[PDB]
Amino acid sequence: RIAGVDIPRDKRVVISLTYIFGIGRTTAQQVLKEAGVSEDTRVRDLTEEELGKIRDIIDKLKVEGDLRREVSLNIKRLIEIGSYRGIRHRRGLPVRGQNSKNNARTRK
Amino acid sequence: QYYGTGRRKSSVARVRLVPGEGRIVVNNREISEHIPSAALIEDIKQPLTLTETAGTYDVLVNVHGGGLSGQAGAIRHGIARALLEADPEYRTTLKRAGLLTRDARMKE
Amino acid sequence: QKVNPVGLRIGVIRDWESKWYAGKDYADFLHEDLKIREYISKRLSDASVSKVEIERAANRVNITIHTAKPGMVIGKGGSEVEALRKALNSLTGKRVHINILEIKRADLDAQLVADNIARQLENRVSFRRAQKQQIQRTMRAGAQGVKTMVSGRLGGADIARSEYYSEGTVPLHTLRADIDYATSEADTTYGKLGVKVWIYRGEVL
Amino acid sequence: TPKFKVQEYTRCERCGRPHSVIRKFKLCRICFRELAYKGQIPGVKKASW
Amino acid sequence: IRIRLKAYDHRILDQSAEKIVETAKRSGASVSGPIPLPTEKSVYTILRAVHKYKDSREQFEMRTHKRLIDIVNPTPQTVDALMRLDLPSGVDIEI
Amino acid sequence: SLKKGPFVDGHLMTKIEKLNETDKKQVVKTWSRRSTIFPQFIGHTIAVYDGRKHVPVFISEDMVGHKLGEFAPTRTYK
Amino acid sequence: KGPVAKRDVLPDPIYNSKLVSRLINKMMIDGKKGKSQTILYKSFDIIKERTGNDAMEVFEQALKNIMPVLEVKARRVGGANYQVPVEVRPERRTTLGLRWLVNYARLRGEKTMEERLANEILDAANNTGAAVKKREDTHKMAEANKAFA
RNA sequence: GUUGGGCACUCUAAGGUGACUGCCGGUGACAAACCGGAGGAAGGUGGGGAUGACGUCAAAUCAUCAUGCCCCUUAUGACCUGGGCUACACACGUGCUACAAUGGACAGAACAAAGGGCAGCGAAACCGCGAGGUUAAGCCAAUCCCACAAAUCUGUUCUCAGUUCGGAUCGCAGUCUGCAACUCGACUGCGUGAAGCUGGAAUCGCUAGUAAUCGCGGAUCAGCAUGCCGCGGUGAAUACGUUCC
RNA sequence: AAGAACCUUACCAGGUCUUGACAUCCUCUGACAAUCCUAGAGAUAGGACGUCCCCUUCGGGGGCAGAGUGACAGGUGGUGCA
């Protein structure tokens, strides 16, 4: 368990960290580099020491509920100014200048 | 030495046969390095095999243009056309395999 | 519709009017040319000029204006010419020259022919007649074909519809055939009417 | 005569029409084609390709 | 002396070089005979869209034909004779 | 660009800097929907043209860094 | 009006078999003949490592069992709807041999294509699997409606 | 080639040559043809483009343009600023990118053609995670710069998972361009991680360097490409036959 | 008409001018003008500052500009069964 997330055992560490909300490939890569540990080792084949080090590096990053809240307070902020983007957030329409007529289904 | 210009597509191979041991050296590399495919190498040797001059001559090609397949066909065509300068008796055996025809299949 | 015969026969059997190389001056030297030829038209609207060939040489711009009325073109002692030059000299910016040759047999050149018919239709000469004068004049000139057309409200006739009196052959099939072509618009008191005039003038062998 | 440089747009320098203009000649597709035919455009002949 | 000729008609461009070479050879300087340089092919494609996606193509083309004329062991009379020669309206004489 | 810094029309920034001399007081009408909201604007009501009418937008803290036109939606749709 | 000549393919350089080349060209996708030249040479090393026989002994045996003898052709003269038993021309035998070999090899469960193609050849050679079945299927069907022709 | 080195070869591009039933066998009116055979790069209509006749829809265009008769003519002319053209319950058309392993990620070699560049291309050097910025080499040019390829191939890892598949979308970083990127730019960091496990009926097109697939350049152009137009790289399957249409 | 941020742009909202944006003149003939100051959202302004056209037998004219001037000019406003 890392940052309160049960990362999978069978897959490699880099992959298992991508599941951790707030960690992608390149974050997982520079975590394990900063941990001074092989990035080819497996989670099932790691050490509790190595886990500790990985866990210490990840504590410096904003991940999971910490990050989810940061993102959510932005949704607040935009609906708290009635900004174009705010209104696009609450309406469920594209917020960055994408057309609606067709090809907007992710939002709609 | 016996010279013969080959052309396929945009490739243009300046073939030169010299008395040797069946080494094809294209732009100062072994043919295997320059042309990876075995199928292409066999087809490049096809004029030397039919005249039974494989192991008689060292082929010194200077190629420029097109790709790896293309470069092949021009070498093949240029070996064939070099052999004709080596021995006019080969014309009959080459011509039967269609090696003396220039493949003028351009893009549409 | 059809390809402009001249369009597809330039640099082939006919030549450039605008004989000049120019790299970075292209547009300057070009739009100049456009004034020069548009000026000599508005000026010499009645002098039977067509092939206003324009050559160039840094600041020595030559204008050959081939004219069927060359005695009329020069003027009383080069009066028309000199006045033409000074305007062009003050417009273009260069030493505008005035070499002049003749359009012998105006009925060989299709611009002049189509210009002749342009006036007849303004002065209300029956479409019928207008062309036939040209046709027969062009035949005697020595032309292997002609195809005058006039199209529009013909005679003030409410319904516009086209009238073409065609003699000889119009071999558009032959890239080496010298098909001249020239269009013109005939503004009467019922709109405008289209003078289109083809002239095959012997093969270019 | 536009205010800023960006606003300044290429217009057909013969037509005046502000569309389709060829930077080499400063002509719209129309004014060019016509003049190309007549053959007043120093070395620009119709092609077959 | 190095001369570069550029034209839209290769005929007048050849007739030019002939004289440029002949005037230099009567002048007595050795000539590098007119090098044909890679002819420039500017193509202009005016499309008139029909049914939107089909589009009647009309292609125009300008060819600048080029010739390079080196004059070796140049002479006073050559340098003169080059300026004396009148290369036509459709040739650009660069020295 | 982002090295040049945030954008604001000098015609507007002058109007609001005159109000910063006094205490807010007046309400500025402008057509500079493109002007960034600076900290100096905080507390003001800015009348911003939405294409037909001027929308009165009160300038709070979270509105700093955005443009004025973010708060004056130009297109009507329900 | 006169039967167009089929394109003369080169022999496969290592097995000297224009059949094996034709397989490569059948396997080739998006003009990636490299990928298919690799896959086959990988598949034939798999066949030779398992069986011990030459891949050519097995592959020719595989084709024998896939290659059709009689095929159904639709004939609708007046009514008819006759599935005319037609003898497969020797070129169309190899065609349908290689087509089915490749088509069913791609559909197999094995992870890599080199293994999938190897296993379909090994199954075809043992007179079993799906590609052999497909030949049987059309022959069973051709035998079923054999009263036409 | 970097330099010396005629220049050979490749190329560049002006002019010539070459292909025909010319030739040799059959076959057949001894002719024509047909069927083969030579020689040639080319086999029997060399291959791509371009170039047609008379016609029709009082077809479409008075928004390319011009234009009789009208109409407006302190306005139906004109000027600016902001906005809209970019809305979206949805549909009709066009295309891109995936729906993984004949891959993804990851490293190591590669091998093009064409076109553009002075108000421009910008070398390299230099900094940044990169997009970019730095200062600027050489060059209106077969000489310098943009380009100097991607597929592929050699590795090399994951293991058939909605995944190292897929990247939508959204949140946060910046970079250029322009007066200005809020509505309304492109691009890059970082995080996020949608649908899709390759779509029926139906329907359209295509006999070879074609289908397919991969990059590149250009036009328009301050910036803006999943379009258009070039350009090359790799490269298929099949045509049995006149059965039905 | 996949090179619409402004421009383009023709539309809308709001401001704004009326030989009018532009246009032959009819003339008078000035410089035209940058300009940078004050507003403005800008246009439209008002204005600091800034006006020598040259040739001229030295008149006038080619002008360009304003004002006048005169019909108009200009219309992407109708009619493609003119």
Tokens standing for residue B29: 């590399």
Please give the Cα distance from C91 to C94 (Å, whole number): 8
Largest Cα span, chain B:
41
DSSP state of E85: -
Per-residue CB contacts under 7 A with strand I, chain C residues 119-158: 153, 158
Q: How far is CA F42 from CA A83, C165, F20, F46, in A?
A: 16, 84, 10, 10
Closest alpha carbon to D43 in C179, E6, C28, C109: E6
Handedness of CA G133, G138, G141, G147 (dihedral sign): negative
Largest Cα span, chain A:
55
C72: left (phi over 0), alpha (psi -120 to 50) or beta: alpha
Phi, psi (degrees; rounded to nearest 5) at C2: -125, 160
Please give the Cα distance from C101 to C65 (Å, whole number): 7
Q: Quick one: which H or E segment has residue B57?
A: strand B57-64
Alpha-carbon dihedral of residues G52, G56, G61, G64, nearest 10 degrees?
Answer: 170
The answer to whether D47 contacts E43, with C-beta atoms less than 8 Å apart, is yes
Q: Which nucleotide is nearest to E64 (CA to C1')?
A: H13
Please give the Cα distance from A4 to A7 (Å, whole number): 9
* Pairing state between β F28-30 and F45-49: parallel
Alpha-carbon dihedral of residues C32, C33, C39, C41, nearest 10 degrees?
Answer: -170
**Type of residue at C84:** L
The answer to whether G10 contacts B41, with C-beta atoms less than 8 Å apart, is no
* Pairing state between β C49-55 and C18-19: parallel
SS3 content of chain E, % helix, strand, coil (to 5): 30, 55, 20
Please give the Cα distance from A101 to A108 (Å, whole number): 11
Q: Quick one: which H or E segment has residue G82?
A: strand G82-87
G12 touches chain B (CB under 8 A): yes
Is G54 strand, coil or helix? coil
- Sequence length of chain B is 108
The binding site of D comprises 12, 15, 28, 31
Q: Which parts of chain C are beta strand (E)?
A: 18-19, 49-55, 62-67, 145-151, 163-168, 177-187, 192-203
Please give the Cα distance from D25 to D13 (Å, whole number): 9
Tokens standing for residue B30: 């072994």
C191 touches strand I (CB under 7 A): yes
To the nearest whole Å, the CA of E92 is away from the closest chain C CA by: 6
Residues C110 and C197 sit within 8 Å (Cβ to Cβ): yes
* Pairing state between β C163-168 and E91-94: unpaired
- Sequence length of chain D is 49
Residues G85 and G145 sit within 8 Å (Cβ to Cβ): yes
Please give the Cα distance from B94 to B4 (Å, whole number): 14
Question: Which residues on D lie below 8 Å from E90 (Cβ)?
Answer: 42-43
Tokens standing for residue G94: 């190899």
DSSP state of C156: G
H103 C1' to A13 CA distance, Å: 22
Which chain H nucleotides are covered by protein, judged by CB under 7 A?
6, 9-15, 39-43, 46, 48-54, 58, 64-69, 81-94, 101-103, 109-116, 119, 140-142, 149-154, 157-160, 163-164, 168-172, 174-186, 189-194, 207-213, 219-222, 228-244
Q: How many helices (H) and strands (E) does chain F have?
A: 1, 3
Q: G121-146 in b/e burial notation, b at 16+ Cβ within 10 A?
A: bbbbbeeebbbbbbbeebbeebeeee
List all residues 6 or more positions away from A84 whose beta carbon is below 8 Å from its beta carbon: A95, F69, F70, F73
List all residues 6 or more positions away from E5 whose beta carbon is below 8 Å from its beta carbon: E13, E16, E17, E20, E34, E66, E67, E68, E69, E87, E91, E92, E93, E94
Residues C194 and C152 sit within 8 Å (Cβ to Cβ): yes
H108 C1' to A59 CA distance, Å: 38
Please give the Cα distance from B72 to B41 (Å, whole number): 7
Q: Tell me the CA end-to-end span of chain A in Å, nearest whole number.
A: 36
10 Å CB burial of residue C182 (0-12, 13-18, 19+) is buried
Name the residue with tokens 């559909």. G107
List all residues 6 or more positions away from G43 whose beta carbon is below 8 Å from its beta carbon: G113, G114, G115, G117, G118, G121
CA angle F69, F72, F73 (to 5 degrees): 105
Nearest C-alpha in D relative to C17: D40
Tokens standing for residue C130: 């207008």
Largest Cα span, chain C:
54
Tokens standing for residue C111: 């611009």
The answer to whether A80 contacts F62, with C-beta atoms less than 8 Å apart, is yes
The binding site of D for Zn(2+) comprises 12, 15, 28, 31
C205 touches strand I (CB under 7 A): no
Please give the Cα distance from B13 to B77 (Å, whole number): 8
Please give the Cα distance from G143 to G149 (Å, whole number): 11
Residues E91 and E6 sit within 8 Å (Cβ to Cβ): yes
**Type of residue at E65:** H
Residues C191 and C14 sit within 8 Å (Cβ to Cβ): no
The answer to whether F73 contacts A84, with C-beta atoms less than 8 Å apart, is yes
Which chains would you list as touching B if contact means 3+ CB atom pairs under 8 Å? G
Which chain I nucleotides are covered by protein, judged by CB under 7 A?
1-2, 5-9, 12-14, 40-43, 62, 82
Please give the Cα distance from D37 to E11 (Å, whole number): 21
Phi, psi (degrees; rounded to nearest 5) at D34: -60, -50
Please give the Cα distance from G111 to G97 (Å, whole number): 23
Handedness of CA A59, A60, A63, A67 (dihedral sign): positive
Q: Tell me the CA end-to-end span of chain E in Å, nearest whole number.
A: 7
Closest alpha carbon to F75 in F45, F56, F55, F47: F55
- Mutant choice from E89, E91, E93 vs C, greatest count of C C-beta within 10 A: E89
Alpha helices in chain C (DSSP H): 5-9, 26-43, 70-74, 79-92, 110-122, 127-141
The answer to whether D42 contacts C22, with C-beta atoms less than 8 Å apart, is yes
Please give the Cα distance from F74 to F51 (Å, whole number): 6
Please give the Cα distance from C142 to E4 (Å, whole number): 45
F10: left (phi over 0), alpha (psi -120 to 50) or beta: alpha
Closest alpha carbon to G83 in G71, G92, G97: G71
Is F54 strand, coil or helix? strand
Is G139 strand, coil or helix? helix
